[PDB]
Amino acid sequence: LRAYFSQPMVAAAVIVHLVTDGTYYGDQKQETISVQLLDTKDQSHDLGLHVLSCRNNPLIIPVVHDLSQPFYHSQAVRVSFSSPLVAISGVALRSFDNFDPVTLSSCPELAVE
Amino acid sequence: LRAYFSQPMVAAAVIVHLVTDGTYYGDQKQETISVQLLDTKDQSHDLGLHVLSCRNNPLIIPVVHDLSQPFYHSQAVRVSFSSPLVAISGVALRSFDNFDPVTLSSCPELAVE
């Protein structure tokens, strides 16, 4: 599931809202969702495998970004799952409202004798 | 080794400059250094165990901060090691020069008919 966004911002977290866990009524296995952030430079950043629970309806996936590496804008989110009973109502991107960390990294007379 | 800093800022990375690996001439074991960032609220954040090498002389330790969690100022760095031959010339804190991410998270007439 490839979801695009109008304004490419940083991704503090990815909110994935589901209405089905994907669990079949005859199978006891749990269902996992894998989320890859996509940049404006078309690069995939893995966010890992997460199980699906109705208790965690708006799944919050926290993006752990290394502060030495530069921040990057996020354009698309690819959610990869291997179960056809999984349903997603909407995918959200969480950003910082006060600042954009990507673009932020971009008088009298003085007399000396 | 508890090193304090004058201006508490964020810690993008910790630079630990060494002049000895701590390796004894009769022992083949490597020597590890553990670094804990200390906050202004007096809380320890673990940065892990790192081996000491003369090739990797400045020893840039990156800090992987989860973007959902709030940023915190760093006051002190505690470097814990269990070998008496380890020597440290200086401990540095790497921050963002353009912005402080902690404190950054803190007209005409309109006529309506």
UniProtKB/Swiss-Prot annotation, chains A, B:
There appear to be no free sulfhydryl groups. Induction: By 8-bromoadenosine-3',5'-phosphate. It is found in: Secreted. High levels in placenta and pregnancy serum. In placenta, expressed in X cells in septa and anchoring villi, and in syncytiotrophoblasts in the chorionic villi. Lower levels are found in a variety of other tissues including kidney, myometrium, endometrium, ovaries, breast, prostate, bone marrow, colon, fibroblasts and osteoblasts. Metalloproteinase which specifically cleaves IGFBP-4 and IGFBP-5, resulting in release of bound IGF. Cleavage of IGFBP-4 is dramatically enhanced by the presence of IGF, whereas cleavage of IGFBP-5 is slightly inhibited by the presence of IGF. Homodimer; disulfide-linked. In pregnancy serum, predominantly found as a disulfide-linked 2:2 heterotetramer with the proform of PRG2. Belongs to the peptidase M43B family. This is Pappalysin-1. It comes from Homo sapiens (Human). The lineage of its organism: Eukaryota, Metazoa, Chordata, Craniata, Vertebrata. The gene is PAPPA. The chain holds residues 1086 to 1221 of 1627 of the full protein.
